[PDB]
Model the fold of this input.
Amino acid sequence: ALVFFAEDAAIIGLAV
Amino acid sequence: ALVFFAEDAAIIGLAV
Amino acid sequence: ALVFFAEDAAIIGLAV
Amino acid sequence: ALVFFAEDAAIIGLAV
Amino acid sequence: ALVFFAEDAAIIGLAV
Amino acid sequence: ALVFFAEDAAIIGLAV
Amino acid sequence: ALVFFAEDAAIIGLAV
Amino acid sequence: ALVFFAEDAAIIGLAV
Amino acid sequence: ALVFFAEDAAIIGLAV
Amino acid sequence: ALVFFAEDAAIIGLAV
Amino acid sequence: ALVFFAEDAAIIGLAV
Amino acid sequence: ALVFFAEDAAIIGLAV
Ligand SMILES: [Cl-]
Ligand SMILES: [Cl-]
Ligand SMILES: [Cl-]
Ligand code: NA
Ligand code: NA
Done:
């Protein structure tokens, strides 16, 4: 899978 | 909201 | 085009 | 994270 | 299929 | 434009 | 609703 | 940045 | 395949 | 149009 | 919910 | 990368 990063603060990984 | 980063060069934030 | 980064490990660029 | 709602009936949350 | 709700005004359902 | 709702907590509108 | 256009050749509309 | 076009009527640009 | 048009400026095709 | 296949259960076509 | 399929190799299901 | 499948007929892969 891929992990996209985003600022939610703190940086989080979104798994796809 | 989430901020996703992308390269456009410069890095930009895309807000959701 | 924009390039989104993702972890796949190595960081890769996804072009849009 | 964000939670988007949808009707599946019951309403469910989709998490991002 | 899922139905997502949106304001278009009236609330509509978008089917997927 | 369409407005999608999401829970961010508070409910927000995302404009498209 | 929105209509997005695309080339399929003919130009088509995608309704949302 | 990208701008996607759609018919909303009038044409609107959706900015990314 | 579909080609979606966007302003990137110049108007470009995004192929799917 | 493209047809994407997803499990909805049965595997169904989603038309784009 | 929907399950979308992708080749990752193995075929994986992505839940929505 | 992930490969998503679609019917275009041929079955094609869309790379992400
Ligand atoms: Cl996943
Ligand atoms: Cl592209
Ligand atoms: Cl369609
Ligand atoms: Na917010
Ligand atoms: Na860059």
